[model samples]
Target: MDTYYDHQLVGLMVQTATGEGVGVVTEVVHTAAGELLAVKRDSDEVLVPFVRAIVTSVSLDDGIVEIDPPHGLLNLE
Candidate 1:
């Protein structure tokens, strides 16, 4: 597991493979289950579920997170 910056209440860039940029993490909701990855990109707030399939990797040093999300995960609208 790679350790980077902790989830702060600020916007950060989100990058992933397949050339997909999901935006930045706006709010990080933590619960007993675990930490929930939430980001606000463009005019939408994308909720990245804590799953392995969607998340390929996360690097704080590079401020980049690689993910392979499901279809319709991103909408240009």
Candidate 2:
């Protein structure tokens, strides 16, 4: 809940605050600034910023992740 390693995040299910399915984390990316999550949804792959301000909650025990991404982060209008 408080801390999650990059490897612990991979393969976890991701969802929006509104409970919309985002995708499954397939990989983790490291940048000079911070970390990123490579989520695969169907045939589409998206890179989501892995930050507290963006990723609200991560329940590895429950195999679920929640995020409050920017309006256009997921290309969801």
Stretches of candidate 2 exceeding 4 Å from the true structure = 75-77
Cα lDDT tens digits for candidate 2, 1-77: 46678778889998778787879888778867777778887777887777866777888789978887777676322
Cα misplacement distance, residue 57 of candidate 2 (Å): 1.6
TM-score of each: 0.59, 0.84
Cα misplacement distance, residue 3 of candidate 1 (Å): 7.6
Q: Which pairs of residues clash in candidate 1, taking residues 3 or more apart in a chain or in different chains?
A: none
On lDDT, the candidate that comes out on top is 2
Worst 10 residues of 1 by lDDT: 1-10
| Model 1 misplaced stretches (Cα beyond 4 Å) | 1-11, 31-33, 73-77
CA error at residue 66 for candidate 1, angstroms: 1.5
TM-score of 1: 0.59
User: What tens digits encode model 1's per-residue C-alpha lDDT throughout 1-77?
Assistant: 54344364235565556877878766555656655557777776766544445566776556656666567654321
RMSD of each: 4.1, 2.7
